[PDB]
Amino acid sequence: SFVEMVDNLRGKSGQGYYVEMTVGSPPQTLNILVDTGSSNFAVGAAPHPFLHRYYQRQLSSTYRDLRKGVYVPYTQGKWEGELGTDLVSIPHGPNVTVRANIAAITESDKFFINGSNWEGILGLAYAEIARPDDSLEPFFDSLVKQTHVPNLFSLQLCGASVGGSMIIGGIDHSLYTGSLWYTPIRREWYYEVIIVRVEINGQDLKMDCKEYNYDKSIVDSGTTNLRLPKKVFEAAVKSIKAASSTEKFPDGFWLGEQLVCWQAGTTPWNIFPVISLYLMGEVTNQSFRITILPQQYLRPVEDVATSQDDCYKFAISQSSTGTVMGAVIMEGFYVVFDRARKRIGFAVSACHVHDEFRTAAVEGPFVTLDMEDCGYN
Ligand SMILES: CC(C)(C)c1cccc(CN[C@H]2CS(=O)(=O)C[C@@H](Cc3ccc4[nH]cc(CC(F)F)c4c3)[C@@H]2O)c1
């Protein structure tokens, strides 16, 4: 019955993917950012310059106050508000209604984006990283506890206005090609995984693989970029620079600040390398890789000119909190968050990213010794 959830995600480039939800009685309709990188369900509950609408608790006969404040600091942006519960539904999702925790956002700083078209966030990760603490049951745990929906969901995030699918409760085989490859969820807090090797245009970076997961690696749909730990970021930019030295770019470009431009249809894709991340597999000494194309880490941005140019931002940026596999890694893959079996699956997406002479891929098996040493402690 998954066909009803196909294409239930909309989004703007660099502004996340959102699904339609309703909260309260009678149902109030809101667009909610889909975020595997956090665990709080929160919605605008008060006027804001960037909100077109918001949650009005007074109008809901089913609203319950929990008489308890809350705040969440993201890497960028944060909000605070009041906890409560209410009835929640997903129109283009499973046919159910659940009572869920809701953080009514009363104040925020750099959380809402100008003209994003969403008014809240749905954190799909585990209770452990919930605020104020792991006793606030996340939305999906409530969904699974109160209904017969199976304990898994999958995300197909499509690039170039963007769309996608959140299949709640299962896998829709019409959304990917090839085989699914699974990597263990290392610990149920973030969707934490272990990267065991990295290659750029087929050349190993040759770092201690702990560096790849320092201090963790997570799969995070709410984050736009691929984010790499300082040491890994520098090695990667150095390698991507060398491969593209044919041309030259401002260095504010490599910092994700300045756009780079080319005459429409003349982007030199061939001079940017593919990036391969190898992930720990399901069996002893076994891994698999996902390969990313430049079309994924060069994010198309709106031209600031009377020009019909193609313009892009570098969508790989530095991190001090570990690797973040954000939307530009997830785009063009079908990603299965198999909570029931503590694993995450990757397959080539039906909306896979296109290149002339190259293709995004999920390939295996590979042999990799001592994958366990790759985890940071
Ligand atoms: C567990 C928690 C305390 C929530 C936490 C703190 C720091 C970092 C993380 C990891 N996950 C984070 C990484 S991030 O802050 O870059 C984006 C964030 C989700 C988020 C929140 C508000 C946002 N506003 C605008 C955006 C951009 C998006 F829409 F493309 C956006 C994204 C993730 O959720 C979690």
Side-chain angles (χ1 to χ4, degrees), residues 12-17 33-40 71-79 110-113 116 118 121 129-131 190 216 218 220-224 227 321 324 327:
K12 305 177 143 296
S13 182
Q15 307 198 12
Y17 294 79
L33 175 73
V34 173
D35 181 30
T36 62
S38 72
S39 304
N40 280 88
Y71 79 91
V72 175
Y74 302 93
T75 296
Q76 331 229 248
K78 52 180 135 58
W79 52 261
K110 295 204 280 294
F111 175 69
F112 299 114
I113 302 179
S116 72
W118 55 261
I121 182 168
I129 59 177
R131 301 304 182 97
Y190 300 95
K216 66 183 166 306
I218 69 172
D220 189 331
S221 63
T223 302
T224 290
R227 294 208 187 122
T321 58
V324 181

mmCIF file of all heavy atoms in Angstrom, residues 12-17 33-40 71-79 110-113 116 118 121 129-131 190 216 218 220-224 227 321 324 327, ligand 1:
data_model
loop_
_atom_site.group_PDB
_atom_site.id
_atom_site.type_symbol
_atom_site.label_atom_id
_atom_site.label_comp_id
_atom_site.label_asym_id
_atom_site.label_seq_id
_atom_site.Cartn_x
_atom_site.Cartn_y
_atom_site.Cartn_z
ATOM 1 N N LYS A 12 12.796 22.692 -1.535
ATOM 2 C CA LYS A 12 13.625 23.587 -2.344
ATOM 3 C C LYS A 12 15.091 23.219 -2.132
ATOM 4 O O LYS A 12 15.466 22.763 -1.050
ATOM 5 C CB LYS A 12 13.392 25.046 -1.935
ATOM 6 C CG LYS A 12 11.929 25.485 -1.998
ATOM 7 C CD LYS A 12 11.746 26.926 -1.522
ATOM 8 C CE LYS A 12 10.676 27.656 -2.330
ATOM 9 N NZ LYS A 12 11.044 27.798 -3.774
ATOM 10 N N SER A 13 15.915 23.412 -3.159
ATOM 11 C CA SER A 13 17.331 23.041 -3.081
ATOM 12 C C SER A 13 18.021 23.733 -1.903
ATOM 13 O O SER A 13 17.925 24.951 -1.745
ATOM 14 C CB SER A 13 18.051 23.411 -4.386
ATOM 15 O OG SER A 13 19.417 23.028 -4.353
ATOM 16 N N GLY A 14 18.712 22.951 -1.077
ATOM 17 C CA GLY A 14 19.405 23.518 0.064
ATOM 18 C C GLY A 14 18.479 23.923 1.201
ATOM 19 O O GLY A 14 18.899 24.585 2.149
ATOM 20 N N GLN A 15 17.216 23.523 1.118
ATOM 21 C CA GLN A 15 16.242 23.948 2.108
ATOM 22 C C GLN A 15 15.465 22.777 2.681
ATOM 23 O O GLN A 15 14.448 22.960 3.346
ATOM 24 C CB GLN A 15 15.283 24.966 1.492
ATOM 25 C CG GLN A 15 15.993 26.129 0.820
ATOM 26 C CD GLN A 15 15.091 27.330 0.608
ATOM 27 O OE1 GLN A 15 13.986 27.402 1.150
ATOM 28 N NE2 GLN A 15 15.562 28.285 -0.184
ATOM 29 N N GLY A 16 15.950 21.569 2.425
ATOM 30 C CA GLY A 16 15.366 20.394 3.047
ATOM 31 C C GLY A 16 14.223 19.766 2.269
ATOM 32 O O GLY A 16 13.773 20.293 1.252
ATOM 33 N N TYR A 17 13.760 18.624 2.757
ATOM 34 C CA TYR A 17 12.606 17.949 2.196
ATOM 35 C C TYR A 17 11.534 17.865 3.261
ATOM 36 O O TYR A 17 11.823 17.507 4.404
ATOM 37 C CB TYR A 17 12.981 16.535 1.748
ATOM 38 C CG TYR A 17 13.952 16.514 0.607
ATOM 39 C CD1 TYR A 17 15.309 16.729 0.825
ATOM 40 C CD2 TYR A 17 13.517 16.297 -0.696
ATOM 41 C CE1 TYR A 17 16.208 16.732 -0.226
ATOM 42 C CE2 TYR A 17 14.414 16.295 -1.759
ATOM 43 C CZ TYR A 17 15.757 16.514 -1.513
ATOM 44 O OH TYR A 17 16.660 16.525 -2.548
ATOM 45 N N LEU A 33 9.664 19.444 7.940
ATOM 46 C CA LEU A 33 10.973 19.001 7.470
ATOM 47 C C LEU A 33 11.288 17.602 7.985
ATOM 48 O O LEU A 33 11.140 17.322 9.183
ATOM 49 C CB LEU A 33 12.057 19.971 7.942
ATOM 50 C CG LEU A 33 13.513 19.582 7.636
ATOM 51 C CD1 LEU A 33 13.793 19.755 6.153
ATOM 52 C CD2 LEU A 33 14.465 20.457 8.462
ATOM 53 N N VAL A 34 11.715 16.727 7.077
ATOM 54 C CA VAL A 34 12.040 15.344 7.419
ATOM 55 C C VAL A 34 13.512 15.247 7.820
ATOM 56 O O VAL A 34 14.409 15.458 7.000
ATOM 57 C CB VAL A 34 11.760 14.403 6.212
ATOM 58 C CG1 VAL A 34 12.255 12.993 6.501
ATOM 59 C CG2 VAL A 34 10.266 14.372 5.922
ATOM 60 N N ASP A 35 13.766 14.935 9.087
ATOM 61 C CA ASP A 35 15.133 15.017 9.612
ATOM 62 C C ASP A 35 15.585 13.782 10.383
ATOM 63 O O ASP A 35 15.208 13.598 11.545
ATOM 64 C CB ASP A 35 15.278 16.241 10.517
ATOM 65 C CG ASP A 35 16.677 16.383 11.067
ATOM 66 O OD1 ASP A 35 17.625 15.948 10.377
ATOM 67 O OD2 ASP A 35 16.832 16.917 12.187
ATOM 68 N N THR A 36 16.404 12.947 9.747
ATOM 69 C CA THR A 36 16.921 11.757 10.424
ATOM 70 C C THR A 36 18.066 12.122 11.367
ATOM 71 O O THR A 36 18.607 11.259 12.047
ATOM 72 C CB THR A 36 17.436 10.668 9.418
ATOM 73 O OG1 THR A 36 18.522 11.185 8.639
ATOM 74 C CG2 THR A 36 16.318 10.222 8.494
ATOM 75 N N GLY A 37 18.429 13.404 11.403
ATOM 76 C CA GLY A 37 19.546 13.842 12.228
ATOM 77 C C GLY A 37 19.176 14.324 13.629
ATOM 78 O O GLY A 37 20.028 14.832 14.361
ATOM 79 N N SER A 38 17.910 14.178 14.004
ATOM 80 C CA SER A 38 17.439 14.616 15.315
ATOM 81 C C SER A 38 16.200 13.813 15.686
ATOM 82 O O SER A 38 15.751 12.977 14.910
ATOM 83 C CB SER A 38 17.106 16.114 15.296
ATOM 84 O OG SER A 38 15.918 16.381 14.557
ATOM 85 N N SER A 39 15.650 14.065 16.870
ATOM 86 C CA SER A 39 14.600 13.209 17.418
ATOM 87 C C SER A 39 13.436 13.966 18.039
ATOM 88 O O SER A 39 12.618 13.375 18.737
ATOM 89 C CB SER A 39 15.184 12.262 18.467
ATOM 90 O OG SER A 39 16.245 11.504 17.918
ATOM 91 N N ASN A 40 13.362 15.267 17.804
ATOM 92 C CA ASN A 40 12.250 16.050 18.325
ATOM 93 C C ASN A 40 11.284 16.438 17.217
ATOM 94 O O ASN A 40 11.688 16.935 16.158
ATOM 95 C CB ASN A 40 12.764 17.316 19.030
ATOM 96 C CG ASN A 40 13.253 17.043 20.452
ATOM 97 O OD1 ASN A 40 14.420 16.698 20.673
ATOM 98 N ND2 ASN A 40 12.357 17.198 21.424
ATOM 99 N N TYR A 71 14.200 23.091 24.683
ATOM 100 C CA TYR A 71 14.907 23.777 23.620
ATOM 101 C C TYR A 71 15.854 22.816 22.906
ATOM 102 O O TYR A 71 16.312 21.828 23.483
ATOM 103 C CB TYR A 71 15.685 24.974 24.181
ATOM 104 C CG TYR A 71 16.995 24.616 24.853
ATOM 105 C CD1 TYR A 71 18.182 24.580 24.128
ATOM 106 C CD2 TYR A 71 17.047 24.326 26.215
ATOM 107 C CE1 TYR A 71 19.389 24.269 24.739
ATOM 108 C CE2 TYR A 71 18.253 24.009 26.838
ATOM 109 C CZ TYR A 71 19.420 23.983 26.095
ATOM 110 O OH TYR A 71 20.620 23.673 26.702
ATOM 111 N N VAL A 72 16.137 23.107 21.642
ATOM 112 C CA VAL A 72 17.046 22.285 20.863
ATOM 113 C C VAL A 72 18.035 23.155 20.101
ATOM 114 O O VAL A 72 17.645 23.999 19.291
ATOM 115 C CB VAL A 72 16.263 21.392 19.861
ATOM 116 C CG1 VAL A 72 17.234 20.625 18.978
ATOM 117 C CG2 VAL A 72 15.366 20.411 20.623
ATOM 118 N N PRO A 73 19.335 22.980 20.381
ATOM 119 C CA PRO A 73 20.409 23.628 19.630
ATOM 120 C C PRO A 73 20.911 22.704 18.529
ATOM 121 O O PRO A 73 21.531 21.678 18.815
ATOM 122 C CB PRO A 73 21.474 23.874 20.688
ATOM 123 C CG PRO A 73 21.316 22.692 21.621
ATOM 124 C CD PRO A 73 19.866 22.217 21.523
ATOM 125 N N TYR A 74 20.644 23.061 17.279
ATOM 126 C CA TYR A 74 21.205 22.323 16.156
ATOM 127 C C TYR A 74 22.582 22.915 15.865
ATOM 128 O O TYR A 74 22.939 23.955 16.410
ATOM 129 C CB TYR A 74 20.286 22.445 14.927
ATOM 130 C CG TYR A 74 18.872 21.948 15.171
ATOM 131 C CD1 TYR A 74 17.870 22.819 15.577
ATOM 132 C CD2 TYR A 74 18.544 20.605 15.010
ATOM 133 C CE1 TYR A 74 16.585 22.373 15.816
ATOM 134 C CE2 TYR A 74 17.252 20.148 15.247
ATOM 135 C CZ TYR A 74 16.277 21.040 15.649
ATOM 136 O OH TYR A 74 14.984 20.605 15.876
ATOM 137 N N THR A 75 23.361 22.257 15.017
ATOM 138 C CA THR A 75 24.619 22.838 14.582
ATOM 139 C C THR A 75 24.392 24.254 14.069
ATOM 140 O O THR A 75 25.166 25.159 14.361
ATOM 141 C CB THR A 75 25.268 22.006 13.473
ATOM 142 O OG1 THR A 75 25.602 20.711 13.985
ATOM 143 C CG2 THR A 75 26.533 22.687 12.974
ATOM 144 N N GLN A 76 23.321 24.448 13.309
ATOM 145 C CA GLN A 76 22.928 25.783 12.891
ATOM 146 C C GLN A 76 21.447 25.947 13.160
ATOM 147 O O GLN A 76 20.639 25.120 12.729
ATOM 148 C CB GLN A 76 23.205 25.972 11.406
ATOM 149 C CG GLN A 76 24.358 25.130 10.905
ATOM 150 C CD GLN A 76 25.354 25.930 10.101
ATOM 151 O OE1 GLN A 76 25.491 25.737 8.887
ATOM 152 N NE2 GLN A 76 26.063 26.837 10.771
ATOM 153 N N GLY A 77 21.094 27.009 13.875
ATOM 154 C CA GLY A 77 19.710 27.231 14.241
ATOM 155 C C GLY A 77 19.354 26.608 15.577
ATOM 156 O O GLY A 77 19.964 25.627 16.008
ATOM 157 N N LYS A 78 18.349 27.177 16.234
ATOM 158 C CA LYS A 78 17.819 26.594 17.453
ATOM 159 C C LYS A 78 16.472 27.212 17.792
ATOM 160 O O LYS A 78 16.129 28.283 17.298
ATOM 161 C CB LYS A 78 18.802 26.789 18.619
ATOM 162 C CG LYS A 78 19.285 28.220 18.830
ATOM 163 C CD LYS A 78 20.253 28.291 20.014
ATOM 164 C CE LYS A 78 21.488 29.125 19.689
ATOM 165 N NZ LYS A 78 21.163 30.533 19.285
ATOM 166 N N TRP A 79 15.706 26.519 18.622
ATOM 167 C CA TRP A 79 14.405 27.003 19.039
ATOM 168 C C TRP A 79 14.142 26.545 20.458
ATOM 169 O O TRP A 79 14.786 25.618 20.949
ATOM 170 C CB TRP A 79 13.291 26.478 18.114
ATOM 171 C CG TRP A 79 13.293 24.988 17.910
ATOM 172 C CD1 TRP A 79 13.818 24.312 16.843
ATOM 173 C CD2 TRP A 79 12.789 23.986 18.805
ATOM 174 N NE1 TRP A 79 13.678 22.959 17.022
ATOM 175 C CE2 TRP A 79 13.051 22.730 18.217
ATOM 176 C CE3 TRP A 79 12.145 24.027 20.045
ATOM 177 C CZ2 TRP A 79 12.697 21.527 18.827
ATOM 178 C CZ3 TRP A 79 11.791 22.829 20.652
ATOM 179 C CH2 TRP A 79 12.069 21.596 20.040
ATOM 180 N N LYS A 110 17.476 31.586 13.713
ATOM 181 C CA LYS A 110 18.033 30.990 12.501
ATOM 182 C C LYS A 110 17.581 29.542 12.292
ATOM 183 O O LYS A 110 18.321 28.709 11.765
ATOM 184 C CB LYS A 110 19.563 31.073 12.537
ATOM 185 C CG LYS A 110 20.088 32.501 12.502
ATOM 186 C CD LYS A 110 21.512 32.560 11.966
ATOM 187 C CE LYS A 110 22.538 32.180 13.030
ATOM 188 N NZ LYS A 110 22.584 33.172 14.149
ATOM 189 N N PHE A 111 16.359 29.250 12.712
ATOM 190 C CA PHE A 111 15.791 27.931 12.514
ATOM 191 C C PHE A 111 14.940 27.899 11.244
ATOM 192 O O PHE A 111 15.204 27.113 10.328
ATOM 193 C CB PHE A 111 14.951 27.545 13.726
ATOM 194 C CG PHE A 111 14.235 26.244 13.567
ATOM 195 C CD1 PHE A 111 14.941 25.054 13.539
ATOM 196 C CD2 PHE A 111 12.853 26.209 13.454
ATOM 197 C CE1 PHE A 111 14.287 23.853 13.407
ATOM 198 C CE2 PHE A 111 12.194 25.007 13.320
ATOM 199 C CZ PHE A 111 12.912 23.827 13.295
ATOM 200 N N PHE A 112 13.931 28.764 11.187
ATOM 201 C CA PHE A 112 13.095 28.894 9.998
ATOM 202 C C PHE A 112 13.816 29.634 8.873
ATOM 203 O O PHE A 112 14.486 30.641 9.109
ATOM 204 C CB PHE A 112 11.801 29.626 10.351
ATOM 205 C CG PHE A 112 10.978 28.918 11.379
ATOM 206 C CD1 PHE A 112 10.773 29.478 12.631
ATOM 207 C CD2 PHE A 112 10.425 27.676 11.105
ATOM 208 C CE1 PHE A 112 10.033 28.809 13.594
ATOM 209 C CE2 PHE A 112 9.686 27.005 12.062
ATOM 210 C CZ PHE A 112 9.491 27.570 13.308
ATOM 211 N N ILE A 113 13.677 29.122 7.653
ATOM 212 C CA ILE A 113 14.286 29.735 6.473
ATOM 213 C C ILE A 113 13.265 30.588 5.735
ATOM 214 O O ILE A 113 12.091 30.227 5.653
ATOM 215 C CB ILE A 113 14.760 28.680 5.467
ATOM 216 C CG1 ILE A 113 15.758 27.731 6.115
ATOM 217 C CG2 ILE A 113 15.380 29.364 4.249
ATOM 218 C CD1 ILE A 113 16.236 26.651 5.160
ATOM 219 N N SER A 116 10.753 28.759 2.830
ATOM 220 C CA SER A 116 11.072 27.339 2.680
ATOM 221 C C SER A 116 9.800 26.517 2.468
ATOM 222 O O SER A 116 9.836 25.434 1.880
ATOM 223 C CB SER A 116 11.812 26.819 3.918
ATOM 224 O OG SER A 116 10.936 26.720 5.029
ATOM 225 N N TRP A 118 8.078 25.091 4.797
ATOM 226 C CA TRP A 118 7.783 24.237 5.944
ATOM 227 C C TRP A 118 7.773 25.011 7.251
ATOM 228 O O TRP A 118 8.400 26.062 7.364
ATOM 229 C CB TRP A 118 8.754 23.046 6.028
ATOM 230 C CG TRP A 118 10.227 23.370 6.042
ATOM 231 C CD1 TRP A 118 11.087 23.315 4.978
ATOM 232 C CD2 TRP A 118 11.024 23.723 7.181
ATOM 233 N NE1 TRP A 118 12.366 23.606 5.385
ATOM 234 C CE2 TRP A 118 12.357 23.863 6.732
ATOM 235 C CE3 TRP A 118 10.743 23.937 8.538
ATOM 236 C CZ2 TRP A 118 13.408 24.203 7.590
ATOM 237 C CZ3 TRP A 118 11.785 24.274 9.391
ATOM 238 C CH2 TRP A 118 13.102 24.405 8.912
ATOM 239 N N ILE A 121 9.593 20.600 12.150
ATOM 240 C CA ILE A 121 10.617 19.608 11.862
ATOM 241 C C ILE A 121 10.216 18.283 12.491
ATOM 242 O O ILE A 121 9.677 18.255 13.603
ATOM 243 C CB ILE A 121 11.996 20.064 12.407
ATOM 244 C CG1 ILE A 121 13.069 19.036 12.065
ATOM 245 C CG2 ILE A 121 11.922 20.263 13.910
ATOM 246 C CD1 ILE A 121 14.490 19.542 12.310
ATOM 247 N N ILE A 129 18.893 10.970 21.855
ATOM 248 C CA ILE A 129 19.329 12.333 21.586
ATOM 249 C C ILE A 129 18.159 13.333 21.581
ATOM 250 O O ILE A 129 18.285 14.463 21.103
ATOM 251 C CB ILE A 129 20.098 12.416 20.232
ATOM 252 C CG1 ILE A 129 19.208 11.950 19.070
ATOM 253 C CG2 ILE A 129 21.352 11.545 20.300
ATOM 254 C CD1 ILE A 129 19.870 12.079 17.694
ATOM 255 N N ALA A 130 17.024 12.908 22.121
ATOM 256 C CA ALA A 130 15.868 13.786 22.265
ATOM 257 C C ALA A 130 16.096 14.818 23.377
ATOM 258 O O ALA A 130 16.775 14.535 24.361
ATOM 259 C CB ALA A 130 14.634 12.956 22.578
ATOM 260 N N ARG A 131 15.537 16.014 23.211
ATOM 261 C CA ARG A 131 15.510 16.994 24.290
ATOM 262 C C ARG A 131 14.099 17.066 24.867
ATOM 263 O O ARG A 131 13.106 16.867 24.155
ATOM 264 C CB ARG A 131 15.931 18.376 23.780
ATOM 265 C CG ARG A 131 17.326 18.441 23.173
ATOM 266 C CD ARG A 131 18.401 17.945 24.139
ATOM 267 N NE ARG A 131 19.753 18.047 23.579
ATOM 268 C CZ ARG A 131 20.593 19.057 23.817
ATOM 269 N NH1 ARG A 131 20.228 20.060 24.609
ATOM 270 N NH2 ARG A 131 21.800 19.066 23.264
ATOM 271 N N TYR A 190 21.889 8.817 17.148
ATOM 272 C CA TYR A 190 21.834 9.194 15.739
ATOM 273 C C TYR A 190 21.725 7.901 14.924
ATOM 274 O O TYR A 190 21.861 6.803 15.473
ATOM 275 C CB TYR A 190 23.104 9.930 15.320
ATOM 276 C CG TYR A 190 23.374 11.211 16.075
ATOM 277 C CD1 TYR A 190 24.214 11.223 17.183
ATOM 278 C CD2 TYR A 190 22.811 12.417 15.663
ATOM 279 C CE1 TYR A 190 24.491 12.397 17.857
ATOM 280 C CE2 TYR A 190 23.081 13.591 16.328
ATOM 281 C CZ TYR A 190 23.926 13.575 17.423
ATOM 282 O OH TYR A 190 24.242 14.750 18.068
ATOM 283 N N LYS A 216 32.137 10.653 15.066
ATOM 284 C CA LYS A 216 31.073 9.747 14.650
ATOM 285 C C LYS A 216 30.737 10.033 13.198
ATOM 286 O O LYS A 216 31.119 11.079 12.662
ATOM 287 C CB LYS A 216 29.827 9.953 15.519
ATOM 288 C CG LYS A 216 29.168 11.320 15.355
ATOM 289 C CD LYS A 216 27.994 11.478 16.305
ATOM 290 C CE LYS A 216 27.547 12.932 16.407
ATOM 291 N NZ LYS A 216 28.670 13.852 16.765
ATOM 292 N N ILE A 218 27.160 9.940 10.793
ATOM 293 C CA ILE A 218 25.721 9.769 10.860
ATOM 294 C C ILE A 218 25.061 10.027 9.510
ATOM 295 O O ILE A 218 25.595 10.766 8.683
ATOM 296 C CB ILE A 218 25.117 10.717 11.905
ATOM 297 C CG1 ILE A 218 25.230 12.170 11.433
ATOM 298 C CG2 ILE A 218 25.849 10.552 13.224
ATOM 299 C CD1 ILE A 218 24.492 13.145 12.324
ATOM 300 N N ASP A 220 21.986 11.811 7.851
ATOM 301 C CA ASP A 220 21.278 12.991 8.353
ATOM 302 C C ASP A 220 20.539 13.720 7.210
ATOM 303 O O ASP A 220 21.129 14.527 6.491
ATOM 304 C CB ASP A 220 22.310 13.921 8.997
ATOM 305 C CG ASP A 220 21.685 15.092 9.743
ATOM 306 O OD1 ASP A 220 20.577 15.545 9.373
ATOM 307 O OD2 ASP A 220 22.326 15.560 10.711
ATOM 308 N N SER A 221 19.254 13.440 7.047
ATOM 309 C CA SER A 221 18.531 13.949 5.887
ATOM 310 C C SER A 221 18.217 15.444 6.001
ATOM 311 O O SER A 221 17.984 16.111 4.998
ATOM 312 C CB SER A 221 17.240 13.158 5.679
ATOM 313 O OG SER A 221 16.363 13.304 6.779
ATOM 314 N N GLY A 222 18.229 15.965 7.225
ATOM 315 C CA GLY A 222 17.957 17.374 7.432
ATOM 316 C C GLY A 222 19.127 18.282 7.091
ATOM 317 O O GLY A 222 18.954 19.496 6.929
ATOM 318 N N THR A 223 20.320 17.703 6.976
ATOM 319 C CA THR A 223 21.503 18.476 6.620
ATOM 320 C C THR A 223 21.731 18.433 5.112
ATOM 321 O O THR A 223 21.603 17.375 4.495
ATOM 322 C CB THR A 223 22.750 17.926 7.328
ATOM 323 O OG1 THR A 223 22.539 17.944 8.744
ATOM 324 C CG2 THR A 223 23.967 18.759 6.996
ATOM 325 N N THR A 224 22.071 19.579 4.526
ATOM 326 C CA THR A 224 22.228 19.703 3.080
ATOM 327 C C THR A 224 23.512 19.059 2.562
ATOM 328 O O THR A 224 23.487 18.280 1.602
ATOM 329 C CB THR A 224 22.225 21.185 2.643
ATOM 330 O OG1 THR A 224 20.910 21.732 2.808
ATOM 331 C CG2 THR A 224 22.634 21.313 1.188
ATOM 332 N N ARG A 227 29.313 16.590 5.270
ATOM 333 C CA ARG A 227 30.252 17.208 6.210
ATOM 334 C C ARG A 227 31.293 16.201 6.690
ATOM 335 O O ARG A 227 30.964 15.098 7.133
ATOM 336 C CB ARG A 227 29.502 17.779 7.423
ATOM 337 C CG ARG A 227 28.579 18.955 7.113
ATOM 338 C CD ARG A 227 28.442 19.859 8.348
ATOM 339 N NE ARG A 227 27.445 20.911 8.172
ATOM 340 C CZ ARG A 227 26.394 21.082 8.966
ATOM 341 N NH1 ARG A 227 26.203 20.267 9.994
ATOM 342 N NH2 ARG A 227 25.537 22.068 8.731
ATOM 343 N N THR A 321 32.121 17.764 14.477
ATOM 344 C CA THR A 321 31.283 16.816 15.206
ATOM 345 C C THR A 321 31.092 15.513 14.435
ATOM 346 O O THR A 321 30.093 14.805 14.620
ATOM 347 C CB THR A 321 29.896 17.423 15.521
ATOM 348 O OG1 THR A 321 29.246 17.813 14.301
ATOM 349 C CG2 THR A 321 30.046 18.636 16.415
ATOM 350 N N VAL A 324 28.880 13.963 8.502
ATOM 351 C CA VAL A 324 27.436 14.037 8.305
ATOM 352 C C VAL A 324 27.140 13.702 6.858
ATOM 353 O O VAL A 324 27.509 14.455 5.951
ATOM 354 C CB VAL A 324 26.881 15.442 8.621
ATOM 355 C CG1 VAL A 324 25.371 15.470 8.415
ATOM 356 C CG2 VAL A 324 27.218 15.818 10.058
ATOM 357 N N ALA A 327 21.953 15.526 2.626
ATOM 358 C CA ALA A 327 21.051 15.329 1.501
ATOM 359 C C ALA A 327 21.797 15.067 0.208
ATOM 360 O O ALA A 327 21.302 14.347 -0.647
ATOM 361 C CB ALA A 327 20.135 16.536 1.336
HETATM 362 C C1 LIG B 1 20.564 15.996 18.589
HETATM 363 C C2 LIG B 1 20.575 17.533 18.318
HETATM 364 C C3 LIG B 1 20.686 18.239 19.714
HETATM 365 C C4 LIG B 1 19.167 17.908 17.742
HETATM 366 C C5 LIG B 1 21.763 17.864 17.354
HETATM 367 C C6 LIG B 1 22.741 18.877 17.585
HETATM 368 C C7 LIG B 1 23.792 19.121 16.667
HETATM 369 C C8 LIG B 1 23.898 18.345 15.484
HETATM 370 C C9 LIG B 1 22.937 17.328 15.226
HETATM 371 C C10 LIG B 1 23.015 16.467 13.946
HETATM 372 N N1 LIG B 1 21.848 16.750 13.070
HETATM 373 C C11 LIG B 1 21.593 18.127 12.559
HETATM 374 C C12 LIG B 1 22.755 18.684 11.685
HETATM 375 S S1 LIG B 1 22.421 20.413 11.314
HETATM 376 O O1 LIG B 1 22.267 21.165 12.541
HETATM 377 O O2 LIG B 1 23.373 20.871 10.332
HETATM 378 C C13 LIG B 1 20.812 20.292 10.526
HETATM 379 C C14 LIG B 1 19.772 19.705 11.530
HETATM 380 C C15 LIG B 1 18.304 19.781 10.982
HETATM 381 C C16 LIG B 1 17.875 21.209 10.576
HETATM 382 C C17 LIG B 1 17.260 22.065 11.531
HETATM 383 C C18 LIG B 1 16.870 23.384 11.174
HETATM 384 C C19 LIG B 1 17.108 23.818 9.848
HETATM 385 N N2 LIG B 1 16.836 25.002 9.272
HETATM 386 C C20 LIG B 1 17.223 25.027 8.023
HETATM 387 C C21 LIG B 1 17.772 23.848 7.685
HETATM 388 C C22 LIG B 1 18.344 23.463 6.341
HETATM 389 C C23 LIG B 1 17.591 22.259 5.720
HETATM 390 F F1 LIG B 1 16.268 22.540 5.581
HETATM 391 F F2 LIG B 1 18.123 21.936 4.508
HETATM 392 C C24 LIG B 1 17.711 22.980 8.915
HETATM 393 C C25 LIG B 1 18.100 21.670 9.246
HETATM 394 C C26 LIG B 1 20.172 18.249 11.936
HETATM 395 O O3 LIG B 1 19.251 17.763 12.923
HETATM 396 C C27 LIG B 1 21.896 17.106 16.160
#
